[PDB]
Amino acid sequence: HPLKTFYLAITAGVFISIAFVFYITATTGTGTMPFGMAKLVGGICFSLGLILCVVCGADLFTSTVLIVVAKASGRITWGQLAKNWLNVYFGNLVGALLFVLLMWLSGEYMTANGQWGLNVLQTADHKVHHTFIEAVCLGILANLMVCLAVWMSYSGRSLMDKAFIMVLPVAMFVASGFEHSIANMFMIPMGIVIRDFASPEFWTAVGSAPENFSHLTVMNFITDNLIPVTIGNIIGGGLLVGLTYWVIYL
Template identity: 55%
Template sequence: MKSPIPSSTPTVINSAHEAPQVSAHFSCYNQAEIYGTSKVVKAPWQSFGLAVFAGAFIALAFVFYLTVTTGAGDAPWGLVRLVGGIAFSLGLILVVVCGGELFTSSVLSTVAWAQKHVSGAELLKCWCRVYAGNFVGAILMVCLITAAGMYELDGGHWGLNALKVAQHKLHHSWIQAFSLGILCNMLVCLGVWMTFASRDVLTKSLLLILPVAMFVSSGFEHSIANLFMVPMGMMIQSIASPEFFASLGVTQEQFADLTVTNFIFNNLIPVTLGNIVGGGVIVGLGYWWVEQGKTTSSDPHKAHHEHFSAPHSHTEKPQHASEIKLTKHS
């Protein structure tokens, strides 16, 4: 049986933030356990509310991406994508710093499930309410961005950029979309995992930029970002005037494949499953498996110290979610 965290080093999960406050002496893996448990045991109403914020944050980041990549002209393709990726990193930074529940990072709660701190049913309920909250936040932003008429920026080229990005996401094969989802959430969850190494907000923000910039610039697929981007394309395709399309030299029919059915079956399902595998299985359970191998070695305490440079007394884990102290955000 695992020993609870010693009282001399209390663990406090700030329920309003993406990352829990933990002792600097805990290893990244131990912090991932606490982080994952905090997601599942959080009050459902609070979890859903923070998920709405996270969905909106990711949508705003995609707006930033579209703005900086519109009208790039003859600029090098890779550099344009890099700038867009750096702009998009704003989304995950807002989630971590301002507080939010994002589905793609919440799948790291597989670590808490593997350690038997939470049940499988609790885990799935958490994922479902966070996904639903992210959807609500993303759709709210679709409505606001449309009402603001942003698709008409730069003579309509902003809207054309959005249409092309949304349509491109529907043209992947199922296995391609699934694979791109895996690659994307490996980077998202590795970025979040790196933030466990620091308690400094600025450092956490900087650590998130390159993983996010890489997955965006490389065209990897993020399910929650797609909950904004594809509906945004569908909205523009359905409400923009014939003059809008004519001025851009395209027709409305060119984007007729932007439909709910195509979105759900050709993109959202495979990408969501890929995100779960990439973040929850490869990163979360992958590190859990490595950790189990370390604890069965001939000198586990020495191995733990060499890898994390943390005192032995701070590496013990809680028995169950109930042993973790929850506090309301002040």
């Protein structure tokens, strides 16, 4: 049902924001840690987002592309196969924005004397510094792992089976910083809010200023991550789709 899908898409937006919150939380205070392993533990923590999404059934942009193809044995028609994408997309964003608001209200950016807020500003910052092609390609790369993770999940029967199997694929595109439109729908707007609203005690604790993140604003988010990344994402999904259809009608 259209409205049902919108609400479950809102839910995914929240699920993915929880994923990123856990990741930021885990990687916060790890300047001394080897970059690989800080990012690794962050990715492993990020997978709560997909274990959640799946185990709970929640529509997340393109995530279940291949499940949907397999629930037709690749003999169903396409309008029927990819209708709601835009409604899901919008539901995802709504969910992520809402969660950002809550997260802001919780005053958590000051966790660890601001280091939490800083991990957000640096993460969200880095993400808005992508050349259109690099961002598309990181978007391709990211949704590759997401779709494959979800896909592999379907063979899993127990709770243990579905979770302990997606952890690796999620941790990999995360700990590699591949770009995912929906995760960034929380992360980048979050770097915005914090940059554009953090008190002086923050900036002072963390030693820094909005100057350092002159790039975190809505306009940049949209044109320098969200757009190229989302595309790359549809390419990642449409790709698995493609290989799917040949392996099947062969």
